Amino acid sequence: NMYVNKVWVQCENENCLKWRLLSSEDSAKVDHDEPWYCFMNTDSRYNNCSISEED
Amino acid sequence: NMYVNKVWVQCENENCLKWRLLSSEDSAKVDHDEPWYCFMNTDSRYNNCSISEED
Ligand code: NA
Ligand code: NA
Ligand SMILES: [Zn+2]
Ligand SMILES: [Zn+2]
Numbered sequence: 692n693m694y695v696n697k698v699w700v701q702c703e704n705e706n707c708l709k710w711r712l713l714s715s716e717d718s719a720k721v722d723h724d725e726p727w728y729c730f731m732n733t734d735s736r737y738n739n740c741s742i743s744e745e746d
Numbered sequence: 747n748m749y750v751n752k753v754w755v756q757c758e759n760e761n762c763l764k765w766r767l768l769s770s771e772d773s774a775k776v777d778h779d780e781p782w783y784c785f786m787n788t789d790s791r792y793n794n795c796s797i798s799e800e801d
Pocket of ligand 4: 757758759762763784795796
């Protein structure tokens with residue numbers, strides 16, 4: 692029995708490229724056929740390309 | 747671009763059933779066709795059914 696709780700997703704702004712931590716539910720709600728950017732993050736702590744990557 | 751860093755795996759000892767956090771590399775090294783138990787955890791902090799689940 693295994694479970695993925697969280698998934699990292701990369702911002703596709705060529706001047707950012709930061710990895711953001713999403714819940715697995717939120718990652719499931721991303722359209723893979725389109726680019727993903729920081730501003731699409733539901734986590735308001737990490738929803739902007741100017742904010743450093745989460746430790 | 748997405749990446750799973752960690753995966754939770756459940757102990758199959760009927761008197762334990764605890765979830766343990768594995769790296770995605772370690773989870774990839776588990777044989778799904780066999781039961782998994784706490785003692786199979788490479789993480790010595792959480793490799794025994796008597797140890798509480800990680801926060
Ligand atoms: Na540039
Ligand atoms: Na019992
Ligand atoms: Zn960004
Ligand atoms: Zn156990």
